Design a protein around this ligand. Structure first.
Ligand SMILES: Nc1ncnc2c1ncn2[C@@H]1O[C@H](COP(=O)(O)OP(=O)(O)OP(=O)(O)O)[C@@H](O)[C@H]1O
Lengths: 286, 74, 353, 87
C-alpha cells in the first residue's frame, strides 16, 4: 500500500493560507481540506490541493460535513488543468486527531481505495520535522475487540521540485548555505545529542509511567523488542571497548596521518609562495 | 440515471477541444509499431509508439489515443 | 455509461505533450549524458528519478524530453526496412522439387543451406569452413527466384529480402547504413538468408563514373565488400545474389568470399522437361488421351516461364474452343505456334544486340 | 491600418484530396499536409484538386486561391523576347 509520503511546502501553505481565512472570520475547529495527491510510484507525493469549508461540532463531537459540490466540480477544474493530479485523501492541521476521523475517511473511500490523511502544523513548535502522515488500515487487535480501524503512522519527508524554488528560496535570504564541511556536521552533533537524548529521557520517563498507570499499552511487543536492538551495545561503563580500543585509534590512524602529511605540504604551499610573492613586491616597490 | 446529459456535455466540449485539435496541423507523421513496458524501479504498464515527422524530426508519444494499435501495420 | 468518463479521463492524459527521440553517444558523468537526436544536435542533459541503470546502454536509442531533454524510456533501435522485407510470400515447399532440374542443383542447394543449420558438428570436428554465401545468376533457364524463394518462404520468420530498388533509396539518401543493417540483422536471425536480384544497375563499377550518382553506388559497394569479406563473422548466415551478367561485379564480387558458390542455371532438358510437364499438367484439365513426350519434343530450349504460360496459352486457345477437356492436338497447335512466335521476338540467344 | 491582414497569406500550397465537402487536404511548403476548412469569402467550388491557395495562419481557414506562377529559371529565358529576323 502506502509506505512513505512526500509533502511539499506549496501544498502545506495551501493549508496555512486557509488558516488566515477561517482565522480572521472564526471560529471553532481547525483547517480541514481535501488533499490532491500524485502517485508515480509506491512512494506518495503531493503537489497542490484545495481547501473546502468544513465544520465539526463539539457536543456532537462526531459531527462533520464535507462539501461534495465543491469536491466534485473543482476536481474537474483541476482535472482539466492537470490530468495526473487527483485526490489521494484529506488533511487537517490537528494538532491531535479525534475519534470521529474514522467517518471522514470511510465516507471518501468511494473516491479512492485508500485515503491518507495528513496532519499538519500551522505554527512550528516542537519537537522536530513537522506535520505527520496516517494511513487507514484494519489491524483488528489481539485482545478480541471487533475489527478496529486505527490510523497507522506513516513517515513523512519534505521534498522540492523544479521552478518552485524561485520565490520560496528567495524570500528567506537569511540562511547561510550550506556550509558543508565545517559548521554543518558539528551543529547536528550538538542536535543529535540534544534531540536524541531528550526523546530518550522522554520515553524512559514514559516507560516508568507505564508501571504506575497507563497499562495497556502493554505495548506489545514493539517497545522492548526494538529497545533490545538498541541494546546490541548499551554502551555502559566503561564502553566495553577493550576489543574496540586498539581499533578506535586505528580509525584515527589515517585521519591524523592525512592531517599532518597534507598540512605540511599545504604549509609548504602557503609559506613558500607567500614569502616569494611578498619579497617580490615589497623590496621592488621602494 | 440522469447524469448522462451532464456527462455527455463534457465529451462534446472535450471533443470541442478536439475540434480545436481538428484545426489545424502543420505537421504530418510516419508511424512505427512499438511495444514498451518499463518495470519500476508501484508499477506503470501500457504501450507506446514511435512518431516521425515531415520536418525530419522523430518524436515520442504514448499509443494513440484515439485510434488504437489494432490498426494498422506502420 | 461511466466508460465515457473513463475514456475522456484517458484523453486528459493525452494532453501530455509528446517527447523527442535520440541516440545515446557516451556519458561524461552521472549528471551529463551525451545524446544525439535524430536531427543530429548533441546535448548533455540530466535525468529524472524514474529511470534505472539499463537506460544508459552502449549507444542505444532513447527518448529525450522537449524541455530539459531528459530521457523518459528507452526502446530498441531500428530503421525498419525489415518488416517491409518480411512482407513477401510464395507457395512451397513443393515448388522445391517441382522444377525437376538440374538434379545436382536440387540436392546441393538443399545441403549448403539446411546442413549447416541442423549439423554444425561436421564443420567443427573436421575443421572446415562452411560456405557463407552463394551466387545464382540468369536467365540460362529458370529456377533462380523459384527455388531460392521457396526455401525462404518455407523458413518462415528467418529470412531477409532485398530489392534492387531500395539501394538507390532517395535523393541524398544513405544506403550505406542499410548495407550495415542488412548484415547486422543477418547476424541476429540465424541462419539468415539474403536475396539480391538484378545487381547490374546497383553493382556499378568505378571504371566509368557517371555524373554524381555513380559514387553513391560505389559507397554501397564498399559497404558490401567490407562486411562480406570480413573481419566480421558471416559464417553462420548464408547470402545469395542474382545478376544477368557478371560483367560489372568487378574482381571484388567475382572473387570467392563475398560471393562463394556460383551455380549457373541450366535450361530444361528433354529428360528434365518430362518432369516439369507433369507438374504443369496438374492444374490444367486434359483429355483422357495425353502424351507428355509430344509437348516436350515440340518445345525445346524454352524456360519454365515459357512452358507454363504457353501451356496456359494453350488453355486460352482451349477456351476459344469452349471445350473443358481438350486433346493435346489443340494444345500442340497453340503450344508450338505461340512459342515459335516468342522466338522471333526476343533476339537472345545467342546473338547480342 | 491594413497591416495585420494580408500578412497571413503565406504560404503557397497545393491541395491533394477531400475527405468531406467542407474539409480538404493541402500539401504545404512545410512538407506536411494541411487539412483545412474555407472562409465565407471563397466558395467551396473555387478550390479544386491541384490548386495553389492562400491561408490565414490565425484561424487556419483558406484565404484566397492564387493560380499564377510562371516558369523555372531555365524556361523563363526560353520565352520569346522581342521580334527578330523579319522576312
Ligand atoms: N518451371 C516453372 N514452373 C512453374 N512456374 C514457373 C517455372 N518457371 C518460371 N515460372 C514462373 O515464372 C516466374 C519467374 O520465375 P524465374 O525467376 O525462375 O524465371 P525468370 O528469371 O523470370 O525467367 P526469365 O528471366 O527468362 O523471364 C515465377 O513467378 C514462376 O511463377
Amino acid at each position: 500500500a502506502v509506505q512513505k509520503v512526500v509533502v511539499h511546502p506549496l501544498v502545506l501553505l495551501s493549508v496555512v493560507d486557509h488558516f488566515n481565512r477561517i482565522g480572521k472570520v472564526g471560529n471553532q475547529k481547525r483547517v480541514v481540506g481535501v488533499l490532491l495527491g500524485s502517485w508515480q510510484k509506491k512512494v506518495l507525493d503531493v503537489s497542490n490541493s484545495f481547501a473546502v469549508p468544513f465544520d465539526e461540532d463539539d457536543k456532537d463531537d462526531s459531527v462533520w460535513f464535507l462539501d461534495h459540490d465543491y469536491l466534485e466540480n473543482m476536481y474537474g477544474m483541476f482535472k482539466k488543468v492537470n490530468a495526473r493530479e487527483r485526490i489521494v485523501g484529506w488533511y487537517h492541521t490537528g494538532p491531535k486527531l479525534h475519534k470521529n476521523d474514522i467517518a471522514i475517511n470511510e465516507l471518501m473511500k468511494r473516491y479512492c481505495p485508500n485515503s491518507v490523511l495528513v496532519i499538519i502544523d500551522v505554527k512550528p513548535k516542537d519537537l522536530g520535522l513537522p506535520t505527520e502522515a496516517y494511513i487507514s488500515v484494519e489491524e483488528v487487535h489481539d485482545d478480541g475487540t471487533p475489527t478496529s480501524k486505527t490510523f497507522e503512522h506513516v513517515t513523512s519527508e519534505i521534498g522540492a521540485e523544479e521552478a518552485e524554488e524561485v520565490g520560496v528560496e528567495h524570500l528567506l535570504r537569511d540562511i547561510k548555505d550550506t556550509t558543508v564541511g565545517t559548521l554543518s556536521q558539528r551543529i547536528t552533533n550538538q542536535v543529535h545529542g540534544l534531540k536524541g537524548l531528550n526523546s530518550k529521557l522522554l520515553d524512559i520517563r514514559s516507560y516508568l509511567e507505564k508501571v504506575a498507570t497507563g497499562k495497556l499499552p502493554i505495548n506489545h511487543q514493539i517497545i522492548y523488542q526494538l529497545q533490545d536492538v538498541f541494546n546490541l551495545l548499551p554502551d555502559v561503563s566503561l564502553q566495553e571497548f577493550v576489543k574496540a580500543f586498539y581499533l578506535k585509534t586505528n580509525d584515527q590512524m589515517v585521519v591524523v596521518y592525512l592531517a599532518s602529511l597534507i598540512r605540511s605540504v599545504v604549509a609548504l604551499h602557503n609559506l613558500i609562495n607567500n614569502k616569494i610573492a611578498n619579497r617580490d613586491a615589497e623590496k621592488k616597490e621602494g | 440515471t440522469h447524469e448522462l446529459q451532464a456527462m455527455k456535455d463534457k465529451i462534446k466540449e472535450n471533443s470541442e477541444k478536439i475540434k480545436v485539435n481538428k484545426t489545424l496541423p502543420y505537421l504530418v507523421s510516419n508511424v512505427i509499431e512499438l511495444l514498451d513496458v518499463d518495470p519500476n524501479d508501484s508499477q506503470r504498464k501500457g504501450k507506446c509508439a514511435v512518431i516521425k515527422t515531415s520536418t525530419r524530426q522523430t518524436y515520442f508519444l504514448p499509443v494513440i489515443g484515439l485510434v488504437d494499435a489494432e490498426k494498422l501495420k506502420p | 455509461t461511466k466508460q465515457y468518463e473513463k475514456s475522456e479521463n484517458d484523453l486528459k492524459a493525452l494532453q501530455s505533450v509528446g517527447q523527442i527521440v535520440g541516440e545515446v553517444l557516451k556519458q561524461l558523468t552521472e549528471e551529463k549524458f551525451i545524446v544525439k537526436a535524430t536531427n543530429g544536435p548533441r546535448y548533455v542533459v540530466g535525468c529524472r528519478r524514474q529511470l534505472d541503470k539499463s537506460k544508459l546502454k552502449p549507444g542505444t536509442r532513447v527518448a529525450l524530453d522537449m524541455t530539459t531533454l531528459t530521457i523518459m524510456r528507452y526502446l530498441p533501435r531500428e530503421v525498419d526496412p525489415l518488416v517491409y522485407n518480411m512482407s513477401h510470400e510464395d507457395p512451397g515447399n513443393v515448388s522445391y522439387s517441382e522444377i525437376g532440374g538440374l538434379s545436382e542443383q536440387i540436392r546441393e542447394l538443399r545441403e549448403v543451406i539446411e546442413l549447416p543449420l541442423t549439423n554444425p558438428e561436421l564443420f567443427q570436428r573436421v575443421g572446415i569452413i562452411p560456405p557463407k554465401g552463394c551466387l545464382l545468376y540468369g536467365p540460362p533457364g529458370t529456377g533462380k527466384t523459384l527455388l531460392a524463394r521457396a526455401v525462404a518462404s518455407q523458413l518462415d520468420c528467418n529470412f531477409l529480402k532485398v530489392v534492387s530498388s531500395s539501394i538507390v533509396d532517395k535523393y541524398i539518401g544513405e544506403s550505406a547504413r542499410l548495407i550495415r543493417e542488412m548484415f547486422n540483422y543477418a547476424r541476429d536471425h540465424q541462419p539468415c538468408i539474403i536475396f539480391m536480384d538484378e545487381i547490374d544497375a546497383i553493382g556499378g563499377r568505378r571504371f566509368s563514373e557517371g555524373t554524381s550518382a555513380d559514387r553513391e553506388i560505389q559507397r554501397t559497394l564498399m559497404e558490401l565488400l567490407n562486411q562480406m569479406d570480413g573481419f566480421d563473422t558471416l559464417h553462420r548466415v548464408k547470402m545469395i545474389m542474382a545478376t544477368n551478367r557478371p560483367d560489372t561485379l568487378d574482381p571484388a564480387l567475382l572473387r570467392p568470399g563475398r560471393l562463394d558458390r556460383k551455380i549457373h542455371i541450366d535450361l530444361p532438358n528433354e529428360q528434365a522437361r518430362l518432369d516439369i510437364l507433369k507438374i504443369h499438367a496438374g492444374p490444367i484439365t486434359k483429355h483422357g488421351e495425353i502424351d507428355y513426350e509430344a509437348i516436350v519434343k515440340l518445345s525445346d530450349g524454352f524456360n519454365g516461364a515459357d512452358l507454363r504460360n504457353v501451356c496456359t496459352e494453350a488453355g486460352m486457345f482451349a477456351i476459344r474452343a469452349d471445350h473443358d477437356f481438350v486433346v493435346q492436338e489443340d494444345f500442340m497447335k497453340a503450344v508450338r505456334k505461340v512459342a515459335d512466335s516468342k522466338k522471333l521476338e526476343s533476339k537472345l540467344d545467342y546473338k547480342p544486340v | 491600418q491594413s497591416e495585420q491582414p494580408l500578412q497571413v497569406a503565406r504560404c503557397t500550397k497545393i491541395i491533394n484530396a477531400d475527405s468531406e465537402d467542407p474539409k480538404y487536404i493541402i500539401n504545404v511548403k512545410q512538407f506536411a499536409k494541411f487539412v483545412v476548412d474555407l472562409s465565407d469569402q471563397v466558395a467551396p467550388t473555387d478550390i479544386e484538386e491541384g490548386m495553389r491557395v492562400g491561408v490565414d495562419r490565425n484561424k487556419y481557414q483558406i484565404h484566397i486561391p492564387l493560380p499564377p506562377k510562371i516558369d523555372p529559371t531555365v524556361t523563363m529565358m526560353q520565352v520569346e523576347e522581342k521580334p527578330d529576323v523579319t522576312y
